[PDB]
């Protein structure tokens, strides 16, 4: 048990919930894990895998991202800030990817899932890039039930960090596609209270949040510290009761412990 791991355990102790952390410092490829191999509900953090899978398809079905997708009134789910504006019209797969990632639009996510042939199509992409842990089982919004002990729509912090590294800094995607993914993550609108809130102001980052029942509060990020090689950081958090409140502050604290321990 390292000093950083002990600090994360202390944070978890006062948090009321269960915390999972995985850092990969590309300066030396070292990792810092806390409950790194335990499963957590991904919620919206799964949107990165879906968008990346569509980016991979676009490497060979070249005009895929410009392909229109019909948005019907019945497609709308619980949170669709972008899709609702296009009901009875269309959005391209690039628009759907941007909406899913940057606004966490759930209807947009469902269109990515549908393009991939269902939740299993997202899992299939995960397997193709070496992630044997990730599993997407349901569409939005039920993939957010986040029931303790339920393996559906879960992953481990270790697996997600390795995957995010491969996708954003490695070669799981073509160069243009990796750049597009990084651009989308950097333009996220929903992350300032999470991982980012625990980083020095001078650092830059891209991230994708997730939230669900059981006060499930997640964030996965690629970070560029001042004067350092990039980091990949996953912070997952989930609580014992279905109606628990969101705790983005716990993710921010975890990120601060990680930054202070570099
Ligand atoms: C079948 C019954 N059932 C299961 C429970 N459930 C949900 O927990 N959905 C969450 C959700 O959609 N989360 C998606 C997600 O992650 N993103 C989007 S929304 C967001 C911007 C808060 C978030 C982000 O980026 O942080 C959600 C959480 C917190 C408040 C409202 C909704 C349902 O939706 C649902 O219907």
UniProtKB/TrEMBL annotation:
It holds the Pfam family Beta-lactamase2. Its EC number is 3.5.2.6. The keyword Zinc does not apply. Keywords: Antibiotic resistance, Hydrolase, Plasmid, Pyrrolidone carboxylic acid, Signal. PROSITE patterns: BETA_LACTAMASE_A (PS00146). InterPro entries: Beta-lactam/transpept-like, Beta-lactam_cat, Beta-lactam_class-A, Beta-lactam_class-A_AS, Cefotaximase. The gene is blaCTX-M-9a. Belongs to the class-A beta-lactamase family. The lineage of its organism: Bacteria, Pseudomonadati, Pseudomonadota, Gammaproteobacteria, Enterobacterales. This is Beta-lactamase.
């Amino acid at each position: 048990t390292s000093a950083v791991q002990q600090k994360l355990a202390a944070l978890e102790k006062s948090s009321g919930g269960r915390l999972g952390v995985a850092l990969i410092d590309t300066a030396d490829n070292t990792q810092v894990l806390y409950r790194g191999d335990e499963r957590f509900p991904m919620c919206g953090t799964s949107k990165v895998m879906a968008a990346a899978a569509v980016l991979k398809q676009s490497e060979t079905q070249k005009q895929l991202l410009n392909q229109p997708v019909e948005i019907k009134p019945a497609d709308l789910v619980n949170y669709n800030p972008i899709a609702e504006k296009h009901v009875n019209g269309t959005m391209t797969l690039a628009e759907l990817s941007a909406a899913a990632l940057q606004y966490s639009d759930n209807t947009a996510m469902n269109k990515l899932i549908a393009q991939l042939g269902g939740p299993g199509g997202v899992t299939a992409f995960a397997r193709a890039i070496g992630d044997e842990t990730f599993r997407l089982d349901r569409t939005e919004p039920t993939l957010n039930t986040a029931i303790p002990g339920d393996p559906r729509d879960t992953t481990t912090p270790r697996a997600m960090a390795q995957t995010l590294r491969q996708l954003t800094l490695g070669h799981a995607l073509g160069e243009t596609q990796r750049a597009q993914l990084v651009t989308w993550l950097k333009g996220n609108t929903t992350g300032a209270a999470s991982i980012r809130a625990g980083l020095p102001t001078s650092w830059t980052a891209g991230d994708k949040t997730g939230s669900g029942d059981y006060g499930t509060t997640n964030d996965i990020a690629v970070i560029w510290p001042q004067g350092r090689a990039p980091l990949v950081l996953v912070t997952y958090f989930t609580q014992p009761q279905q109606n628990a409140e969101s705790r983005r502050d716990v993710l921010a604290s975890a990120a601060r412990i990680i930054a202070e321990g570099l």
